[PDB]
Design a protein around this ligand. Structure first.
Ligand SMILES: [Mg+2]
Ligand SMILES: [Mg+2]
Ligand SMILES: [Mg+2]
Ligand SMILES: [Mg+2]
Lengths: 147, 205, 97
RNA sequence: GCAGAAGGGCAAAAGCUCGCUUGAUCUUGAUUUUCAGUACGAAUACAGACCGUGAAAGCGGGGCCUCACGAUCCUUCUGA
RNA sequence: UUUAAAUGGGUAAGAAGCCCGGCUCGCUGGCGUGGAGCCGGGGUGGAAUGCGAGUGCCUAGUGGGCCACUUUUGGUAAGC
RNA sequence: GAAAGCCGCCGUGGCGCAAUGAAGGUGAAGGCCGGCGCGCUCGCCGGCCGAGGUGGGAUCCCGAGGCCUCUCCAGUCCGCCGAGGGGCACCACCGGCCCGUCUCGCCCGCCGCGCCGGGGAGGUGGAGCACGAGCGCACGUGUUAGGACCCGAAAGAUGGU
RNA sequence: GCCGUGUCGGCGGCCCGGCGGAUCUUUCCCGCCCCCGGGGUCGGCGGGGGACCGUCCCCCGGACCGGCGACCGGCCGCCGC
RNA sequence: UCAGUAACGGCGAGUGAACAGGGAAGAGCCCAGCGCCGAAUCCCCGCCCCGCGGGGCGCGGGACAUGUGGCGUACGGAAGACCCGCUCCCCGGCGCCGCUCGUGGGGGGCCCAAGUCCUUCUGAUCGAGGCCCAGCCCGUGGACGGUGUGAGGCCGGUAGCGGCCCCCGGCGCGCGCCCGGGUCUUCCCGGAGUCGGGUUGCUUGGGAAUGCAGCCCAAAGCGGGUGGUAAACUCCAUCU
């Protein structure tokens, strides 16, 4: 849309949006991210702290599957199953607990986040944080680990 | 060259890049070229299906992906051995063979042995001149269609257990917890050392 | 009680016990071939990095006789398959006498 | 007179002399000083130990105060 | 330097203030002592003049200046 | 028509919904009432609830009172309304929670009693939570990598005449 | 003759509606493993039914305007020949 | 996609992979060596079989080759002797007859309808008109030239339209080769100046050397390679 952009409205002004004095040439501060410590220090400080140096252990050839663990915290603990069973199996004729597993829903770890409701469930995951299991064991549900 | 707050950028155009560029102005032309090589191939051969052989069921390599099922390469002989067909007979019947594939489970082995005989159940052959060595009558009353599509026996079938509902018992609601992992990990990095501290008690003499 | 982390990791599956592959058997001695290489160390002889190595092994040092093969054959674990069979041929040249 | 350059400041003292001594130590922050309201530097009040001195109140984390000093990366050491 | 202006700089001119009643504390400790915090209750008009304000985002240009009373430093002096 | 439409048991994946530590790893809920173990500054059981609280806070609600041709017999309405209420977003603040650490003190657990686990109270570091706002497309502006607004060297290198 | 959102009923087609649901179904259907030529579901598997929930399709009853959902006759008041 | 990520770098400027995972296509095999078969192997030469535009099995003569040709054989195991239960195939060509998939490919010549009336212009391809069938053809209104703007005047566009010629893959007589399968028994089982180490140059993201190359040292057989921090021990994983 060259009708809409700037250079039509500026076409006729001499210096073309760049000033008489400075007179925009090509590269007055060097090409790229030049001048890290020398003469653009105040730009790299105050907007990018931490850019200069080592911090940690080198780790040759990590493979992004060994440390793969997704998290459902307990807000989303009932989006896994249908709404059809969070009320149909909510009737305490006896301890009719539904199971909920997350490793068929693409999740490995169950973390904690507030308001697990008052239905006793059995929740299957490979890892439970100890706030999450004490929200399941304090609504009368059990927390069955699986692999 | 940088100004007020922004990303720091390493754009990889310092190298010469305008002499290797690849516009895909032929990717519609390459799609309807390789549909002619599926139209005029699947009709040219046979009532044999398109999309190749029967592939077996294969479970993925990454911890990330071991929970799922994939169309693998070939039934690795053993599945040709428990089901009992000859290996060089198998790849003209329409059964893929991958000899460098191993089986270190009995759970996964019978998961393809039933699959292979199920393929051999839904197979009909054409004997040459109708003396019929070990094929039945007229051609399964007819071939019923010309070609099959997108895989023989639907190689995904990512099935899952129902596991309907249960009563929480006494043992299940007291034990199996987070502290059963912190001591489980503590028998992973404090196990070899405790083999060595018991050698200290066998040299205490 | 399955668990994905710990000592007994992973999904509990049964294991197939089966005859190993035939490429897995590469360097068995296979008596026909031992007959060749025992016939050949009396028709050909030894090398001059091991004519000297036994005459340090029979007398002076066996650390240094290891440390002489260590320098002249590549690895340390190759030199514990030379030294303790240089000594064996020296044994059956000594204790067959 | 107070190590030295000046200026402020100092009297049963901040000077001299005697007696003891290691607060010139260990640790988190906040604040001031040129300041962009960034850093090093120096400095001010604190809080937690552990100590010294004094009969005691207290006073001390360097010199009566204002200067006396130095990043990344790398090397060296010390700590669980 | 005893003294010491003119011009000048900071704060203040209220309801976010005052007062009364009651609880808290692991601080302070002759002492319901001190001091903070929290809760409820009673009373608005608080120098003159003028005026609609607060608040965040992205940011171009610029980073050679010069002149004049006035006060001034170096200079014999200057359109220095 | 090198379009357009469809797939979803092609959502693999990308970015987002969870952060933090060098790392192993860990990983964001409170408020009240009853009561109890020596209510020890420390602590525990049953229920209701449920993102805590102070100050402002547009809007909305209640609203004493005021409003018409004779004085009583009344209605939806309208009109200002002193005070008072529920207070969106956002701002200042106090409180809590997660993780790294630091100091201080006891308590609890046992696929099996240890140079094991789990914990509590205060202080701090964090690109966090405290009822999510992102993704995709398009356009404008700004800043860079690209011959990069057009035109400009003294030079440098390779291969040749 | 109309259609909006509903209660039900006739489940009327569910076993000759459509589609879902990590609802429910070891008395159901074969091929498995476990157990001394056969059995015990003996627990689940791969497969294939049908019972049930939620939502849109014919009927009679019920709701209000009959609204761009319209034809009919009836009226007033136009208009043209 | 992983990912402008691990990693490299006066750790500055900047460069920067791979495995997972989803797709396109998916075809597998041969030998040396260890062994059995009395070289059962091949080339050239000459004759005739008899065939095209020629290539063959026959018939006789010179070579290669035992320093090792050909059959079976390849690490997924193989070979022989058993025993038992099934089966005689496949392979190319041949003049040819029938299909061809857009109905194969190539070539040439053909296939709808207005110049009818008025009118303007130098010229029409313009303007207007064609009763009630809408003047006419439309599977043909793409385009092009034609005295100017043309569905109809002409090439031609449309059509699983025809006919004509030449070549493609696939009938059936005369060719030519021609027993596999499961258990048990025994026997065989593998590539060296190569692998690796020391050093030196280049290179890479490869970082206590990833690859490459030189020079030196130079292997073993339960051996060897790899397992992304140098190393020793100890299991294991995978590969040959
Ligand atoms: Mg400029
Ligand atoms: Mg600009
Ligand atoms: Mg996009
Ligand atoms: Mg030159």
């Amino acid at each position: 849309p060259s009708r809409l952009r700037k250079t039509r409205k500026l076409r006729g002004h001499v210096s073309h949006g760049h000033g008489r004095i400075g007179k925009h040439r090509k590269h007055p501060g060097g090409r790229g991210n030049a001048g890290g410590l020398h003469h653009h220090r105040i730009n790299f400080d105050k907007y990018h702290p931490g850019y200069f140096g080592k911090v940690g252990m080198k780790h040759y050839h990590l493979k992004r599957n060994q440390s793969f663990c997704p998290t459902v915290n307990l807000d989303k603990l009932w989006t896994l199953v249908s709404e059809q069973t969070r009320v149909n199996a909510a009737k305490n004729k006896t301890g009719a607990a539904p199971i909920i597993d997350v490793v068929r829903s693409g999740y490995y770890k169950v973390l904690g986040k507030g308001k697990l409701p008052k239905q006793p469930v059995i929740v299957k995951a490979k890892f439970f944080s100890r706030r999450a299991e004490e929200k399941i064991k304090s609504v009368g549900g059990a927390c069955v680990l699986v692999a | 060259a940088p100004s007020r707050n922004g990303m720091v950028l390493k754009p990889h155009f310092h190298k010469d890049w305008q002499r290797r560029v690849a516009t895909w102005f032929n990717q519609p032309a390459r799609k309807i070229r390789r549909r002619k090589a599926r139209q005029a191939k699947a009709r040219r051969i046979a009532p044999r299906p398109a999309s190749g052989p029967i592939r077996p069921i294969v479970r993925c390599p990454t911890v990330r992906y071991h929970t799922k099922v994939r169309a693998g390469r070939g039934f690795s002989l053993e599945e040709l051995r428990v089901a009992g067909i000859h290996k060089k007979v198998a790849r003209t019947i329409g059964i893929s063979v991958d000899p460098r594939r191993r089986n270190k489970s009995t759970e996964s082995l019978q998961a393809n042995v039933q699959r292979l005989k199920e393929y051999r159940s839904k197979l009909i052959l054409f004997p040459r001149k109708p003396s019929a060595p070990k094929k039945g009558d007229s051609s399964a009353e007819e071939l019923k269609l010309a070609t099959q599509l997108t895989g023989p026996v639907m190689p995904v079938r990512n099935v899952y257990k129902k596991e309907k509902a249960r009563v929480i018992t006494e043992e299940e609601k007291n034990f199996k917890a987070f502290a059963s992992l912190r001591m489980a990990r503590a028998n992973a990095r404090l196990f070899g050392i405790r083999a060595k501290r018991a050698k200290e008690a066998a040299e205490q003499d | 009680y399955p668990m994905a982390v710990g000592l007994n990791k992973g999904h509990k599956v049964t294991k197939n016990v089966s005859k190993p592959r035939h490429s897995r058997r590469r360097g068995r001695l296979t008596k026909h071939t031992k007959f060749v290489r025992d016939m050949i160390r009396e028709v050909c002889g030894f090398a001059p990095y091991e004519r000297r190595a036994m005459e340090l092994l029979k007398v002076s040092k066996d650390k240094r006789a290891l440390k002489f093969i260590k320098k002249r054959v590549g690895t340390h674990i190759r030199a514990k398959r030379k030294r303790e069979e240089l000594s064996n041929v020296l044994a059956a040249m000594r204790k067959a006498a």
